[PDB]
Amino acid sequence: KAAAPACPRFDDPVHAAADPRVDVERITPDPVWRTTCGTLYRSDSRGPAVVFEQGFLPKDVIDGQYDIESYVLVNQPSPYVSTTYDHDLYKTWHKSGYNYYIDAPGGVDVNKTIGDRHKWADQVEVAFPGGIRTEFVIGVCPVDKKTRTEKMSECVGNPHYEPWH
């Protein structure tokens, strides 16, 4: 094989945002940004026809919960779209229909920002302020709820995905 190259470093930490109205200075605590560029994942019940068209939009960039600890622990409407480093986290999700694959720069590394002591540290989450544009959504695999497995013959690539590294 070969050894992997480092990742491109973007100047804007929310370059990936689907809603650029997000206010980075409102993020608390001081965010530790993800600097790796491996695939990330999101369990979502929303279908690819919607996600491939819109990307992942956050619930409320205006008056949503900008405190990452509060958002992780109680999940009010927020400027964030959560993803995970863990390909298999979909297996822990009740009924969410799809495992989305994401290739996006940046995001707030939740455990590096609020520590790995908290209740949901096992989710190894990356929270995207402003969400995630469709160009950074690779594709999706539907999940068979009864076996908690991906239906790999039914995965779909996002025609809008734009490789960048």
Numbering used by the authors: 36 to 200
Pull verbatim passages from the article behind this deposition.
Scabin shares nearly 40% sequence identity with the Pierisin family of mARTs.
Our model suggests that Tyr129 reaches into the DNA minor groove and contacts both the DNA I and II strands. However, binding of DNA substrate is likely controlled by a rather large contact area and contributions from several backbone and side-chains within the Scabin active site. Several replacements at Tyr129 were made to ascertain the chemical nature of the Scabin-DNA interaction. The rest of the Scabin variants showed either a WT-like crystal structure or similar CD spectra to the WT in solution.
